[PDB]
Amino acid sequence: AQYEDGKQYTTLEKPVAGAPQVLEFFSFFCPHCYQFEEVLHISDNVKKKLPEGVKMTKYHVNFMGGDLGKDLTQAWAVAMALGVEDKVTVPLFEGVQKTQTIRSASDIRDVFINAGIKGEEYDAAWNSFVVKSLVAQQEKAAADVQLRGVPAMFVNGKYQLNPQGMDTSNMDVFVQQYADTVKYLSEK
């Protein structure tokens, strides 16, 4: 057929109960994730095609970058709690990988301050248990899909996107296939 298990996607041996409908994993340290987000715009292209009543969820991962990697997962939790993901995603990627001016937790915070988030507001969120549980949720989700690498995307806790089974040709043909595959999986 057009969409095939083992080609555009794979099927988790162990489906995840109560998982987000569309779950993306990434790291601000991840060069392919930079490409995915800032050049290919995978998230946005996927969202433009998602059915009504389907939400996209995006989690950060710890295993790249040591202590700064975990700081970034905690800051991503802050971004989720404050609902400012679309203000900090680009300057966090560029700060980590382009300018490489993000080297400490304070440098991360600066990105939020510069983006208009009040210091008191960031710090309260940073130290909150709501953010601790969001960090735990992201870690839990990684365990549940038995995550081995980023970027990655899972649909309805049952299917894993398999970009190596898609075409690499035109980045755009690739992006369209990826987005088309997510939509197909969402309706499966």
CATH number, residue 114: 3.40.30.10
Domain total for the chain?
1
- Sheet containing strand 9-11, edge to edge, reads 9-11, 159-161, 152-155, 22-26, 56-60
DSSP string, the chain: --S-BTTTEEE-SSPPTT--SEEEEE-TT-HHHHIIIIIS-HHHHHHTTPPTT--EEEEE-SSSSHHHHHHHHHHHHHHHHHT-HHHHHHHHHIIIIIS----SHHHHHHHHHHTT--HHHHHHHHT-HHHHHHHHHHHHHHHHTT--SSSEEEETTTEEE-GGGS--SSHHHHHHHHHHHHHHHHT-
Domain that holds residue 134: 1-188
The length of the chain is: 188
